[PDB]
Design a protein around this ligand. Structure first.
Ligand SMILES: CCCCCCCCCCCCCC(=O)SCCNC(=O)CCNC(=O)[C@H](O)C(C)(C)COP(=O)(O)OP(=O)(O)OC[C@H]1O[C@@H](n2cnc3c(N)ncnc32)[C@H](O)[C@@H]1OP(=O)(O)O
Ligand SMILES: CN(C)CCCN(C)c1nc(N(C)CCC#N)c2sc(C(C)(C)C)cc2n1
Ligand SMILES: CN(C)CCCN(C)c1nc(N(C)CCC#N)c2sc(C(C)(C)C)cc2n1
Ligand SMILES: [Mg+2]
Length: 411
């Protein structure tokens, strides 16, 4: 059933996943010396290319591949259009490894055909709380604690093959070359997410969406007018009213994040993320990189009253090309990123996220039901969407966990 995935160090079935009681590696321990410096073989008409994702023109080349060939819905209505600025931000965090950005080009004429990207992340990925309890009950705490220390691993994203080259087994070769490049740097695990079901997720969460500009969303067929609104003389007027928001934030002391807020934001974020089984550990340099505002890319606000930062939220922008329509070329989506609340309930903090996003011209706010995202769904009028984000590890056995025990946001 899976000619490629059956050959890789990942759990092969749900049944297998059920037998997993401790975090730890799947594969033989190996060393960098066991990995060849010769690149993985590829047919003679293609070549590997390493783009420089800090250089405008190479970012632009990858940007066009993704704009024309990346994730789309099944009815070919919308295709993600991650911006050039977004790609530089997502792919070049502190201490990134340029060799982990991997492309394939056609050799004759240098046409770009495929891409995959890894970035470093320090992740807590030790045995989860409910399974450490089971271990204590069996006298197996030593084995369950073996890999408690946060690990320096790889996060994979942006795998893309050109539409003309689909179903030719190019994605497996991309994945094996990426694995070689990561292994050459003495890293042996990865974390990745996808919408599709592959062998075998350790967690799965549904997507949720919150309408900000319902008239546009109905026009482009992202949304429909629900049946119940047909009982009204003006269904659209009533739908707009339903999703109406304040025109300015409600929380006293809300302001954009600045560099001097980095230590306090790191403190409150790391205290909060510690409560979840799987989550990142960020340095001050990483907090700066992933959270300081960047025009068109990431938006972050702190609540500061009386000279103390007590809460914050962040969101990032992913537009989509509107493939079929005549009034509109883009869908502008805001995605909930990291946050932490110590002074106000989460629903009150995230209402200000929706207000700022609407003010800035976003059409919808989306999120996965990770973190405590379920805690404000109903009051803030999010609804569940037809999509899931499945969380996977490469070369790491891991017990199934609930999505509310995952604290890693993937872009
Ligand atoms: C230690 C370091 C390790 C580093 C590596 C860690 C692993 C990282 C793994 C990658 C994490 C990526 C995270 C993201 O970026 S998720 C976003 C993925 N990108 C897209 O959906 C964009 C649009 N689609 C495409 O570009 C292509 O359809 C892709 C490239 C996805 C497949 O190309 P194509 O359709 O032309 O197929 P093929 O003939 O070449 O290959 C077929 C094989 O590919 C398996 N397949 C299909 N989709 C995925 C998928 N999303 N993850 C993993 N495997 C996938 C499939 O089951 C089959 O294997 P098997 O069923 O026969 O066994
Ligand atoms: C196996 N599949 C296709 C699960 C499909 C999940 N994906 C990739 C996906 N993607 C989507 N987008 C790309 C929307 C934002 C953009 N781009 C959408 S937009 C959508 C409606 C809101 C129109 C129903 C469903 C949907 N589904
Ligand atoms: C690697 N990564 C983390 C790919 C995040 C892509 N994104 C941005 C994404 N993805 C979606 N998927 C179903 C996962 C597709 C994949 N991969 C959806 S489904 C959705 C609704 C329209 C239902 C709200 C928004 C949305 N957004
Ligand atoms: Mg292919």
């Amino acid at each position: 059933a899976h000619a490629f995935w059956s050959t890789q160090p990942v759990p092969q079935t749900e049944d297998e996943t059920e037998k997993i009681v401790f975090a730890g590696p799947m594969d033989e321990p190996k060393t960098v010396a066991d990995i060849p410096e010769e690149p993985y073989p590829i047919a003679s008409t293609f070549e590997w290319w390493t783009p420089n994702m800090e250089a405008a023109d190479d970012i632009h080349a990858i940007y066009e591949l993704l704009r024309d060939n990346y994730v789309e819905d099944d009815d070919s209505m919308f295709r993600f259009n991650y911006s050039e600025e977004f790609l530089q931000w997502a792919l070049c965090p502190p201490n990134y490894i340029p060799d982990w950005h991997v492309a394939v080009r056609r050799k004759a004429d240098k046409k770009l055909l495929a891409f995959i990207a890894g970035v470093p992340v320090t992740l807590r990925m030790g045995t989860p709380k409910y399974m450490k309890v089971k271990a204590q009950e069996k006298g197996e705490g030593e084995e369950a604690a073996k890999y408690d220390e946060p690990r320096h691993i790889c996060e994979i994203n942006f795998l893309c093959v050109h539409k003309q080259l689909r179903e030719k087994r190019l994605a497996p070769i991309l994945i094996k070359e990426a694995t070689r490049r990561v292994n050459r740097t003495n890293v042996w695990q990865a974390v990745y997410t996808a919408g599709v079901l592959l062998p075998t997720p350790y967690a799965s969460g549904q997507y949720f969406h919150r309408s900000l500009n319902p008239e546009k969303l109905v026009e482009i067929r992202f949304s429909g007018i629900p049946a119940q609104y047909q009982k009204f003389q003006n269904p659209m007027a009533m739908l707009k009213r339903n999703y109406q928001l304040p025109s300015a934030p409600k929380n006293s002391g809300l302001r954009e994040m600045k560099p001097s807020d980095v230590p306090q934001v790191r403190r409150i974020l790391m205290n909060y993320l510690d409560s979840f089984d799987v989550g990142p550990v960020f340095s001050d340099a990483e907090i700066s990189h992933y959270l300081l505002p960047r025009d068109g890319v990431v938006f972050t606000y702190v609540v500061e009253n009386d000279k103390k930062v007590t809460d914050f939220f962040s969101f990032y922008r992913i537009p989509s090309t509107v493939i079929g329509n005549s009034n509109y070329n883009l869908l502008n989506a805001a995605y909930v990123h990291y946050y932490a609340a110590t002074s106000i309930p989460l629903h009150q903090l995230i209402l200000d996220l929706l207000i700022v996003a609407h003010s800035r011209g976003f059409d919808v706010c989306n999120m996965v039901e990770i973190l405590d995202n379920r805690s404000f769904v109903e009051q803030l009028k999010f609804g569940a969407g037809d999509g899931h984000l499945r969380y996977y590890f490469y070369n790491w056995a891991y017990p199934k966990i609930k999505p509310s025990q995952v604290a890693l946001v993937m872009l």
